[PDB]
Design a protein around this nucleic acid. Structure first.
Ligand SMILES: [Mg+2]
Ligand SMILES: [Mg+2]
Ligand SMILES: [Mg+2]
Ligand SMILES: [Mg+2]
Ligand SMILES: [Zn+2]
Lengths: 141, 136, 94, 38
RNA sequence: AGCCAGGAUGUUGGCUUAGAAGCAGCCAUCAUUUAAAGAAAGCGUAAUAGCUCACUGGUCGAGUCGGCCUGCGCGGAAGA
């Protein structure tokens, strides 16, 4: 939290560490490694699950590798398994596509003790309510 | 393109286009494009403009066209003497006096109706101005 | 509440009304009631902006000719053929 | 530069100027916008 | 007007996405931290973006903005 000094995010899912197909060559280049992308990967990946996507810091000064404490899996990641489709768009607005509910995704994004906006926690409730409306589902609030 | 589907006679005396225009009020839509000058609009003219505006607004709102050709214009081709009969109708025009509302429109933002009319205007041989509907 | 000032017309017909408009006043008229109609002359700019507000055509306006106050409603306009301006107005004394 | 009867701002960085008797467009952002002879 | 700041969070936006993280794509155009900030302004990367903007704080200290009716001009205008 100072300025620009290393940080990116190009992955797929925590249940396959280091992937070469989607991100490939561009995950280790500037004091960052395509091999070491697993040690601090599983410093607490499996400790919870290998079924949720998560990007992370990098932080570099010229040192051998890089230190990058992590945080949340997004809230668009938790609409494939826990709140409907696995495609997402469908036909986003020609027809309502799919539906959800206020209870669904409440706790799934209320757990966020490492991200969110709204001292009032009912606020960052509706401040996750849209990563489901980004695919124009249906309001079963 | 516009033209009479049929007419009592093939050709008209050239005539003159004196006078001020009947049909001077935006009387069908919210906005109009009004003739400020005198002259002839030709069907291609009317149509070129009509397209211009229609596409500006896309499949939105509605349009009316107040003027309609009905005046047949003949010409003589090259390499022909004078006389030997009145020439052959080649196209149609509408006589436009100053004041004529030409096209009306509604179902769109004023600003858009302006843009749209600005564009159609450029296709027209005569000066025009933006007008608006009025009580009374 | 709409207040229009007006002299009466010392002369009439085409020549005079043209001369009026040339001078940025235009002619108008008042009638209805049992009184005779009144050949009126209004200043252009002032009456113009007034009639821009729709209320002008619905409200009862008050015309003012030498001191006296006439209560009227706009009955008809004759606008210019293509310019933002008025050529004539009918007022209904009501 | 582009020379012709109608000359116009094209970007927000366009500027219109008169130098001698001649309307010119001057763009700080895009050389293709530079006009003359308006 | 100018100069100093910020321009954020759902959200790297789900997305017929090979890769897009605003960006031809894809539809919607909703949402929270606020002074304000656009699933959107930009030249634009292999994707990050690096960097100015619409917007709103500070500064400054009195005018400023552009449509209407009009007079006279200007460019548009090359020939033996
Ligand atoms: Mg006479
Ligand atoms: Mg010189
Ligand atoms: Mg200022
Ligand atoms: Mg000239
Ligand atoms: Zn420019």
């Amino acid at each position: 939290a100072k300025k620009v000094q290393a940080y990116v995010k190009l992955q797929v899912a925590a249940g396959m560490a280091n992937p070469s197909p989607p991100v490939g060559p561009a995950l280790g280049q500037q004091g960052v490694n395509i091999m070491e992308f697993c040690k601090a990967f599983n410093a607490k990946t499996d400790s919870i699950e290998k079924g949720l996507p998560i990007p992370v810091v990098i932080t570099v000064y010229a040192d051998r590798s890089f230190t990058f404490v992590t945080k949340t899996p997004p809230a668009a990641v938790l609409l494939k398994k826990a709140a409907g489709i696995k495609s997402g768009s469908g036909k986003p607005n020609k027809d309502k596509v799919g539906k959800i509910s206020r209870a669904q995704l409440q706790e799934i994004a209320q757990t966020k003790a490492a991200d969110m906006t709204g001292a009032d926690i009912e606020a960052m409730t509706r401040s996750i309510e849209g990563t489901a409306r980004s695919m124009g589902l249906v309001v079963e609030d | 393109m516009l033209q009479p589907k049929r007419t009592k006679f093939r050709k008209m005396h050239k005539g003159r286009n004196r006078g001020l225009a009947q049909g001077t009020d935006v009387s069908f839509g919210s906005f109009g494009l009004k003739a400020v000058g005198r002259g002839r609009l030709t069907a291609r003219q009317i149509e070129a403009a009509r397209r211009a505006m229609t596409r500006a607004v896309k499949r939105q709102g509605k349009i009316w066209i107040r003027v309609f050709p009905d005046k047949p214009i003949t010409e003589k081709p090259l390499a022909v003497r004078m006389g030997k009969g009145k020439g052959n109708v080649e196209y149609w025009v509408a006589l436009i006096q100053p004041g004529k509302v030409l096209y009306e429109m509604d179902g769109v933002p004023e600003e858009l109706a302006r843009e749209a009319f600005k564009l159609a205007a450029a296709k027209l041989p005569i000066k025009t101005t933006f007008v608006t509907k009025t009580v009374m | 509440m709409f207040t229009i000032n007006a002299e009466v017309r010392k002369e009439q017909g085409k020549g005079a009304s043209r001369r009026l408009r040339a001078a940025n006043k235009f002619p108008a008229i008042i009638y209805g009631g049992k009184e005779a109609p009144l050949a009126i002359e209004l200043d252009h700019d002032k009456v113009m902006n007034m009639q821009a507000k729709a209320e002008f055509y619905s409200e009862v306006l008050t015309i003012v000719v030498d001191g006296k106050e006439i209560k009227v409603k706009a009955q008809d306009v004759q606008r210019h053929p293509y310019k933002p301006k008025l050529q004539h107005i009918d007022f209904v004394r009501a | 530069m582009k020379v012709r009867a109608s000359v116009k701002k094209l970007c927000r960085n366009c500027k219109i100027v008169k130098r001698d008797g001649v309307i010119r467009v001057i763009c700080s952002a895009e050389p293709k916008h530079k006009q003359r002879q308006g």
